[PDB]
Amino acid sequence: GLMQFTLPVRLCKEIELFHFDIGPFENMWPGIFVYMVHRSCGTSCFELEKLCRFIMSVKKNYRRVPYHNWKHAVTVAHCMYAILQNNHTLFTDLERKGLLIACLCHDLDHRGFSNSYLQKFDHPLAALYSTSTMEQHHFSQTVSILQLEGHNIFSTLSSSEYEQVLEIIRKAIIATDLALYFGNRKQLEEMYQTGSLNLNNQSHRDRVIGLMMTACDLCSVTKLWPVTKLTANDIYAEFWAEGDEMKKLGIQPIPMMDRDKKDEVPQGQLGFYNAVAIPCYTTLTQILPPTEPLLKACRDNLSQWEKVIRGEE
Ligand SMILES: CCCc1nc(C)c2c(NS(C)(=O)=O)nc3ccc(OC)nc3n12
Ligand SMILES: [Mg+2]
Ligand SMILES: [Zn+2]
Known part of the structure; x- marks a missing residue:
């Protein structure tokens, strides 16, 4: 219980910042995650033997795909750690515990393909789960790993707390x-602006935690x-692979996913920043003011993508 993780000084300091990169050394990522748990939650939240064994089973069930991989899992967990640390009185003990685990597990056993591709392929998962296909699979794989012998990091919780955290x-x-x-985000935008948003209302908390998950x-x-x-x-690289597999099914992919149309990437990016990313961090900053650095950095990067389109780089 007196065993803390420490990081080298540059990491110890930069890990507190939203824009932190977890680096190219795979073997430090489990340590980075435990470090974040111990500071965010406490050194008593999880039994270290169980946490370490849960983390390495989760790692093992991420696939070697270009983006939706173990590095994404830990990157998305770090963003949640930064949001939780900058807003530490807004969230319960259970929420701190649950949300870092949720981020680490949120893309478990991802194959690099969208819910649409599984559906057009007619993948068995699409018959098992008609909507949020991959995401119901990610939750299912999470519960599977929790029920492995020695992996139940929530074993010290009461019956009620266990059921709440899951x-x-x-x-x-x-x-x-x-x-x-x-x-x-539309519902949260409406609730914030008419003043009706209430974080003691469980269905409002749910929506806000949803937006935090999109932001991470x-x-x-x-x-x-x-x-x-x-x-x-x-x-x-995943988009173009999915576009390839679409063509193999006899379906012209949208231009974003067609590797023969790589010049239309920079404009595919702009749409995504304006339709998804900017509104996401804007609404989040309105509800959680300390998350403003995410919105600012997102805007800085939109500006960098606009430059790429003009041929300024
Ligand atoms: C994996 C799909 C969701 C997603 N996550 C991220 C971080 C991005 C992203 N970022 S980036 C680093 O600037 O290329 N660009 C995207 C462009 C289009 C798009 O359409 C769904 N999603 C994008 N996207
Ligand atoms: Mg996903
Ligand atoms: Zn993800």
Whole structure:
């Protein structure tokens, strides 16, 4: 219980910042996650033997895909750690515990393909889960790993608390379905602006936690320009593979996913920043003012993508 993780000084300091990059050393990422748990939650939240064994089972069930991989999992967990640390009195003990685990597990066993591709392929998961297909699978894989012998990091919780935390994780992971994001943010926008938003209302908390999950999940748009620019190559590599597989089914993919139309990437990016990312961090900043650095960094990067379109770089 007196065993803390420490990081080297540059990491110890930079990890507190929203725009932190977890680096290219895979073997430090589990330590980075435990560090964040111990500062965000407490050193008693989880039994270290169980946490370490949960983390390495989760890692093992991320696939070697260009973007939706173990590095994404830990990156999205760090963004949630930054939001929680900057807003530390707004969230319960259970929410701090649940949300970091939810972010680490939110893309478990992702294959690099969208819910639409699974559906057009007629993948078995699409018959099992008619909506939020991959996201119901991610939650399912989470529960699977929790029920492995020695992996139940929630074993010290009461019956009620256990059921609450699994319900926090389920809604948190389902909210990473971008199809649900548009309506969720619209409702929050309305609630904030008419003054009706109330964080003691569980259905309002749910929506706000949903928006936090979207903000963490898209946090690659909030990094320093060189990180954001290079992450775009990994995202587009999955898009083009999915476009290829669409063509193999006899379906012309949208232009964003067609590797024969790579000149129309910079404009595909702009639409995504204006329709999804900017509104997401704007509404989030309105509800959680300390999350403003995410909105500012997102705007800085939109400005960098506009430059790329003009041929200024
Ligand atoms: C994986 C789909 C969701 C997603 N997450 C991120 C971080 C991005 C992103 N960022 S970047 C680093 O600037 O390329 N660009 C995207 C462009 C289009 C798009 O259409 C769905 N999604 C994008 N996206
Ligand atoms: Mg996902
Ligand atoms: Zn994700």
